[PDB]
Amino acid sequence: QPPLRRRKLEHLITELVHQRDVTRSLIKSKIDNAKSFEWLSQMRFYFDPKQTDVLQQLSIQMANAKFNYGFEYLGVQDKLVQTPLTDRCYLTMTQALEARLGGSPFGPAGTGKTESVKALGHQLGRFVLVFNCDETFDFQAMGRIFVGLCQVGAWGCFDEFNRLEERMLSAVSQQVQCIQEALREHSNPNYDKTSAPITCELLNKQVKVSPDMAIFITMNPGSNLPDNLKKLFRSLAMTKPDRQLIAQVMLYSQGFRTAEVLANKIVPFFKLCDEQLSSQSHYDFGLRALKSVLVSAGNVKRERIQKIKREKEERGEAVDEGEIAENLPEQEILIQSVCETMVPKLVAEDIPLLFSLLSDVFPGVQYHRGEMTALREELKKVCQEMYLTYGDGEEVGGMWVEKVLQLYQITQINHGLMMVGPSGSGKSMAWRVLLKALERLEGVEGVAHIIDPKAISKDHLYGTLDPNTREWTDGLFTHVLRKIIDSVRGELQKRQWIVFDGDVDPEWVENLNSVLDDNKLLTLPNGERLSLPPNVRIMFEVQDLKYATLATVSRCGMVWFSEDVLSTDMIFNNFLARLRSIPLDEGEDEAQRRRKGKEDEGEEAASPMLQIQRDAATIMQPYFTSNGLVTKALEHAFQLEHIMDLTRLRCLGSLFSMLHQACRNVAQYNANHPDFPMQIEQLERYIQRYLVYAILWSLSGDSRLKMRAELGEYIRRITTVPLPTAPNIPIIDYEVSISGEWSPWQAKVPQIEVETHKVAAPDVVVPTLDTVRHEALLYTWLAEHKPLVLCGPPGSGKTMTLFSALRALPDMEVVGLNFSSATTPELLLKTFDHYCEYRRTPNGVVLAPVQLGKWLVLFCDEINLPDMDKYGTQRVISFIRQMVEHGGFYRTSDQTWVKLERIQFVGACNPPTDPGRKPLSHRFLRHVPVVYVDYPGPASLTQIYGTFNRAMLRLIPSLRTYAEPLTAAMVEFYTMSQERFTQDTQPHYIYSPRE
List binders of another protein among 468-507 (CB under 8 A).
468-470
**Count of residues of this chain found to bind ligand ADP when the rule CB under 6 A is applied:** 36
Partner from ligand ADP, another protein, ligand ATP, none binding residue 58, C-beta < 5-8 Å depending on class? another protein
Partner from another protein, ligand ADP, ligand ATP, none binding residue 234, C-beta < 5-8 Å depending on class? another protein
Shortest distance, CB of residue 628 to ligand ATP, whole angstroms? 16
Question: What's the chain's Rg over C-alpha atoms?
Answer: 36
Partner from ligand ATP, another protein, ligand ADP, none binding residue 574, C-beta < 5-8 Å depending on class? ligand ATP
Count of CB atoms within 10 A of residue 47's CB?
10
Q: Is 92 in the site for another protein (CB under 8 A)?
A: yes
Partner from another protein, ligand ADP, ligand ATP, none binding residue 389, C-beta < 5-8 Å depending on class? ligand ATP
Shortest distance, CB of residue 651 to ligand ATP, whole angstroms? 13
Distance (Å) of CA 741 to CA 246, 695, 877 = 76, 17, 42
Partner from ligand ATP, another protein, ligand ADP, none binding residue 291, C-beta < 5-8 Å depending on class? ligand ADP
In degrees and rounded to multiples of 5, residue 103 shows phi and psi of: -90, 145
Q: Is 994 in the site for ligand ADP (CB under 6 A)?
A: yes
Q: Is 455 in the site for ligand ADP (CB under 6 A)?
A: no
SS3 (DSSP) at 777:
helix
State the binding site: 107-114, 421-428, 792-799
Side chain identity at 576, as an amino acid letter?
L
The residue within the footprint of ligand ADP, chosen from 104, 116, 409, 423 (CB under 6 A), is 116
Of 604, 608, 621, nearest in space to 684 by CA:
621
266 vs 347 by CB, closer to ligand ATP: 347
The residue within the footprint of ligand ATP, chosen from 253, 336, 514, 573 (CB under 6 A), is 573
Say if residues 411 and 537 touch (Cβ distance below 8 Å): yes
Distance of alpha carbon 835 from alpha carbon 852, whole angstroms: 12
Residues 226-265 contacting ligand ADP, CB under 6 A: 241, 246
Give me the residue whose beta carbon is nearest to ligand ADP: 112
Q: Length of the chain in residues, anyone?
A: 995
661 vs 799 by CB, closer to another protein: 799
Shortest distance, CB of residue 543 to ligand ATP, whole angstroms? 5
Q: Is 502 in the site for ligand ATP (CB under 6 A)?
A: no
Report how far apart the first and last C-alpha atoms of the chain are (Å, whole number). 85
Q: Is 243 in the site for ligand ATP (CB under 6 A)?
A: no
Distance (Å) of CA 252 to CA 23, 25, 339, 432, 903 = 18, 20, 21, 42, 65
Q: Is 818 in the site for another protein (CB under 8 A)?
A: yes
Shortest distance, CB of residue 784 to ligand ATP, whole angstroms? 15
Q: To 5 degrees, how large is the angle CA 391–CA 397–CA 400?
A: 110
Greatest C-alpha distance within the chain: 130
The residue within the footprint of ligand ATP, chosen from 923, 931, 933, 944 (CB under 6 A), is 923
Q: Which stretch binds ligand ATP (CB under 6 A): 71-79, 175-183, 453-461, 570-578?
A: 570-578
Kindly write out the interface string for residues 776-795 of this chain, putting x where it contacts another protein by CB under 8 A and - elsewhere.
------------------xx
Q: Is 423 in the site for ligand ATP (CB under 6 A)?
A: yes
Say if residues 895 and 475 touch (Cβ distance below 8 Å): yes
Q: Is 388 in the site for ligand ATP (CB under 6 A)?
A: yes
311 vs 395 by CB, closer to ligand ATP: 395
125 vs 398 by CB, closer to another protein: 125
Q: Is 397 in the site for ligand ATP (CB under 6 A)?
A: yes
The two beta strands, 742-744 and 734-736, are antiparallel
Q: Is 319 in the site for another protein (CB under 8 A)?
A: no
Q: Is 773 in the site for ligand ADP (CB under 6 A)?
A: no
Distance of alpha carbon 839 from alpha carbon 587, whole angstroms: 19
Q: Is 800 in the site for ligand ADP (CB under 6 A)?
A: yes
Residues 596-625 contacting another protein, CB under 8 A: none
The residue within the footprint of another protein, chosen from 21, 44, 88, 520 (CB under 8 A), is 88
Distance of alpha carbon 304 from alpha carbon 324, whole angstroms: 9
Find the DSSP H helices in 421-565: 427-442, 458-462, 476-486, 513-516, 550-555
Helical (H) or strand (E) element with 60: strand 58-62
Q: Is 38 in the site for another protein (CB under 8 A)?
A: yes
Say if residues 524 and 892 touch (Cβ distance below 8 Å): no
Distance (Å) of CA 394 to CA 149, 381, 397, 399 = 61, 19, 8, 7
Partner from another protein, ligand ATP, ligand ADP, none binding residue 391, C-beta < 5-8 Å depending on class? none
Distance of alpha carbon 713 from alpha carbon 727, whole angstroms: 12
Q: To 5 degrees, how large is the angle CA 803–CA 807–CA 808?
A: 125
| Exposed / middle / buried, residue 424 (Cβ in 10 Å: 0-12, 13-18, 19+) | buried
Say if residues 674 and 449 touch (Cβ distance below 8 Å): no
Dihedral sign for Cα 838, 841, 846, 848, please. negative
166 beta partners: none
Side chain identity at 688, as an amino acid letter?
Q
Distance of alpha carbon 314 from alpha carbon 819, whole angstroms: 72
Shortest distance, CB of residue 646 to ligand ATP, whole angstroms? 14
Distance of alpha carbon 56 from alpha carbon 69, whole angstroms: 7
364 vs 727 by CB, closer to another protein: 364
Q: Which stretch binds another protein (CB under 8 A): 224-232, 472-480, 851-859, 882-890?
A: 224-232
Shortest distance, CB of residue 555 to ligand ADP, whole angstroms? 14
Q: Is 33 in the site for another protein (CB under 8 A)?
A: no
352 vs 965 by CB, closer to another protein: 352
Q: Is 949 in the site for ligand ATP (CB under 6 A)?
A: no
Q: Is 403 in the site for ligand ATP (CB under 6 A)?
A: no
In degrees and rounded to multiples of 5, residue 235 shows phi and psi of: -100, 145
Q: Where are the beta strands (DSSP E) in 556-624?
A: 557-559
543 vs 698 by CB, closer to ligand ATP: 543
Q: Which stretch binds ligand ATP (CB under 6 A): 425-433, 512-520, 685-693, 980-988?
A: 425-433
**Count of residues of this chain found to bind ligand ATP when the rule CB under 6 A is applied:** 21
| Exposed / middle / buried, residue 264 (Cβ in 10 Å: 0-12, 13-18, 19+) | middle
Shortest distance, CB of residue 378 to ligand ATP, whole angstroms? 14
Say if residues 798 and 908 touch (Cβ distance below 8 Å): yes
Shortest distance, CB of residue 807 to ligand ATP, whole angstroms? 33
The residue within the footprint of another protein, chosen from 228, 513, 568, 665 (CB under 8 A), is 228
Kindly write out the interface string for residues 229-258 of this chain, putting x where it contacts another protein by CB under 8 A and - elsewhere.
-xx--xxxx-x-------------------
Helical (H) or strand (E) element with 798: helix 798-806
Helix, strand, coil % in the chain, rounded to nearest 5: 45, 10, 40
Residues 858-917 contacting another protein, CB under 8 A: 861-862, 865, 910, 915-916
Q: Is 9 in the site for another protein (CB under 8 A)?
A: yes
Can you give the three-state secondary structure of 519-532, one letter per residue?
A: CCEEECCCCCEEEC
The two beta strands, 845-849 and 836-840, are antiparallel
Distance of alpha carbon 33 from alpha carbon 296, whole angstroms: 44
Q: Is 429 in the site for ligand ATP (CB under 6 A)?
A: yes
Partner from ligand ATP, another protein, ligand ADP, none binding residue 97, C-beta < 5-8 Å depending on class? none
Residues making contact with ligand ATP (CB under 6 A): 383, 388-389, 397, 400, 421, 423-429, 543, 566, 570-571, 573-574, 923, 926
Residues making contact with ligand ADP (CB under 6 A): 80-83, 86, 109-116, 241, 246, 287-288, 291, 762, 764-766, 768, 771, 794-800, 908, 936, 944, 993-994
